Write a protein that binds this ligand. Structure first.
Ligand SMILES: Nc1ncnc2c1ncn2[C@H]1C[C@H](O)[C@@H](COP(=O)(O)OP(=O)(O)O)O1
Ligand SMILES: [Mg+2]
Lengths: 149, 357, 357
């Protein structure tokens, strides 16, 4: 069977790619289950299934496992959703430079053009040192969905 | 020597669980340990037959599985078939010549019988998912990954029978058999029983529950659902079984039944610990063989090995042994599903007037 | 030596019933003798529990009985309790270490298990008619007329077990055990097995049916009908049991299963005849104790003894033994109910004219 990657290409279905991601999002968390997320996903595989739809399903599954007995699913579902939202905007996990991004966004009319008028490339690169993108790993799932939504 | 009906009238309430006077009259109006009478009544109420479960839809599910998942399922089935094959005969052969109270003798015979229903249900599942059941059955005896643990498990059973036979034929003491010296120690016989019960406890409370994870992990994917119904019925019996061996081990270890037995329990505390630890490592290596060609949605080597460490700590603590693994949360919580089965309008202004704004 | 899981991969279809390789894998997709697989399925379908039977009206009926009819019933009950107490454990202890085909091993465990329900049902009946069941149970061991009969049945069981232990520990041949010479003959062990099965056949096909007459004779008078319901369920099981021992004995005797066994069967044919005749002779003596204080409507010492002679001829002929008693019609035919389940007006004058007076 074949899945459809984010970049359009296709490769043989490999569940280890899913174990890797979930093991990552559950690392450090207490009383979470990789097996639970995969099974509660009830992910229906078909030939050519998009790898993006696969990830959104395991996000919903991990998000609905938030309970009193297992509170840390709020961070498992958040880390999965941040990972999904990173790919949605950049095509990768690593965010670009603040300047390269603002230039592209101001050019698309999605940002205000005053950003380039008030801050220089030397200043933008100085604020990219202020940024700590690992603070995306301190959100709860409800926080990430309000960001995305 | 063992007698099927001892002539001496003994108060069955004062007899020990094992090695006392062989039971004569089977009465169920009183018990020394009522745990076994409750287990009989509960096992009798759980009575099921394999044919009463629809497993015909599982053939489609099985053939649709990937080839490495056919391997996972069919290997866990051969191992199950082997385990409950030993469990079919052995509790009767190894324990009946030693039991000295009626409520425990009947329980062991009810326990062993319920295992034969499990053996029959494995025949039911096999003939309903594969084309030639002979392929599955004939592989169980020759298969290396099973045979290694099969001969290890049966040894504790075989040795208890053998020592029991010498204890009946010759009696306690030092003897001579065809130029060779043979010493029959009742204390060593009590030791071989305790070690056997510990091995049986790990068989039914760890080894089988590791297998239950594989049977139910397919059911969590709505696959092999006829099997799962049968395995779920088995797990309900298998819960009663390990409880029996638990109460036996604890009654022996606490010295309630036999004061000498409490001493023997402490001399074996190291052997029993290594016995359980060996079982957990064997099931981990078994998991390494199950997923060697790939994993499935919800189950891999790591997940299953975590359950091995999880369930092992629980079982060993229940029999008073130190925990060999780190404290861990349940790595497959989904398995527990299967293992345990207009406004009052009136106003009072005077009451409101009692108020200063 | 006996092993709970034999290492050898053997064609279980070609093994003999007994003394072959101990069974390893319990499979039920094939049988050498399908009689035992059919016996298993039928015994599993007859599964009943004693508590599901209404016996509350039996307390009043029993206490209303005359003193001598209380004696008949409670004595026939104690004898039943003793017989199915032996039958609960003995087929497991005496036959399981010897069986070498799986369908027979599982049948013996199913057979023995169904006997444990009988033992539980006797406890159910006893505790529902008497005030202190301890009085009834404690008499079984001390009563002279019952304890005497226990030694006759258990001897064939005990002797087979002991010889079985020597054959497992030492093997066949001449040995020396603590200054004594001990010769272990497999032909003598096969001889001890056959004689034991003959005694069990006489127990289940003659001795118990003598008891069935007493339980049902009270029911024909609409008394103790809760007991009768249970005894009828037991008799339905007891029909399967004697069928099992019949097929074992006949397969052995014909040499079909073991050619050597056909020879041994003829050497015992006189022992087996005297074994059955003695059993019938013993039940007659038992009838004398039931009616020593008086008889009841429909049953006395003579009536029951005629049934002993009647039922003995049937069973002995079924196992290839000569008939010891005279041919007789069934003296209690009622027992078989319990053991098995506008004128047409037209006239034709022309046709009448075709007639000469
Ligand atoms: N061959 C495959 N089969 C099944 N799932 C896969 C897969 N490759 C990746 N995935 C999973 C892992 C991720 O949780 C999810 C998408 O993550 P990603 O790394 O952004 O996608 P991709 O690797 O397709 O670019 O899909
Ligand atoms: Mg990827």
């Amino acid at each position: 069977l074949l899945v459809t990657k984010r970049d359009g290409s296709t490769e043989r279905i490999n569940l280890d790619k899913i174990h890797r991601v979930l093991d990552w999002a559950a690392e450090g968390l207490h009383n979470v289950s990789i097996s639970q997320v995969e099974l509660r996903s009830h992910i229906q595989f078909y030939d050519g299934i998009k790898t993006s739809d696969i990830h959104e399903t395991i996000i919903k599954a991990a998000a609905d496992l938030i309970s009193r007995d297992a509170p840390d699913y709020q961070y498992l579902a958040a880390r999965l959703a941040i990972f999904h939202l990173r790919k949605k905007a950049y095509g990768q996990f690593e965010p670009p430079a603040l300047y390269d991004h603002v230039v592209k966004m101001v050019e698309m009319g999605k940002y205000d053009n005053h950003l380039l008028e008030d801050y220089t490339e030397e200043e933008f690169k100085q604020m990219d040192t202020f940024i700590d993108h690992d603070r995306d790993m301190t959100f709860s799932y409800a926080a990430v969905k309000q960001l995305e939504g | 020597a063992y007698t099927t009906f001892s002539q001496t009238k003994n108060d069955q309430l004062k007899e020990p669980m094992f090695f006392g006077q062989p039971v004569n009259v089977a009465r169920y109006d009183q018990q020394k340990y009522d745990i076994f009478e409750k287990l009989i009544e509960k096992q009798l109420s759980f009575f099921w037959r394999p044919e009463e479960v629809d497993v015909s839809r599982d053939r489609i599910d099985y053939q649709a599985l990937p080839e490495h998942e056919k391997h996972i399922f069919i290997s866990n089935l051969k191992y199950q078939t082997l385990l409950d094959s030993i469990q079919g005969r052995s509790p009767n052969v190894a324990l009946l010549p030693l039991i000295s109270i009626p409520e425990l003798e009947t329980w062991v015979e009810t326990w062993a019988f319920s295992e034969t229903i499990h053996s029959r249900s494995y025949t039911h599942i096999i003939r309903n998912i594969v084309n030639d059941p002979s392929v599955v059955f004939d592989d169980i005896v020759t298969n290396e990954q099973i045979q290694k643990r099969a001969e290890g498990i049966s040894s504790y059973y075989d040795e208890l029978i053998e020592m029991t036979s010498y204890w009946h034929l010759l009696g306690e003491g030092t003897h001579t058999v065809n130029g060779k010296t043979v010493t029959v120690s009742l204390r060593e016989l009590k030791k071989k029983l305790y070690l056997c019960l510990m091995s049986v406890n790990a068989l039914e409370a760890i080894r089988f529950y590791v297998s239950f994870a594989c049977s139910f992990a397919f059911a969590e994917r709505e696959l092999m659902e006829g099997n799962a119904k049968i395995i779920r019925l088995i797990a309900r019996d298998e819960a009663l079984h390990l409880t029996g061996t638990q109460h036996m081990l604890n009654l022996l270890r606490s010295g309630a039944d036999d004061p000498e037995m409490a001493e023997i329990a402490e001399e074996c505390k190291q052997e029993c610990y290594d016995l359980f630890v060996q079982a957990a490592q064997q099931e981990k290596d078994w998991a390494d063989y199950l997923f060697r060609d790939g994993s499935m949605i919800g189950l891999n080597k790591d997940i299953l090995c975590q359950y091995v460490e999880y369930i092992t700590n629980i079982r060993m603590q229940a029999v008073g042994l130190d925990l060999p693994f780190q404290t861990r949360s349940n790595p497959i919580p989904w398995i527990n599903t299967w293992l345990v089965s207009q406004i009052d309008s009136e106003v009072d202004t005077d009451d409101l007037s009692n108020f200063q704004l």
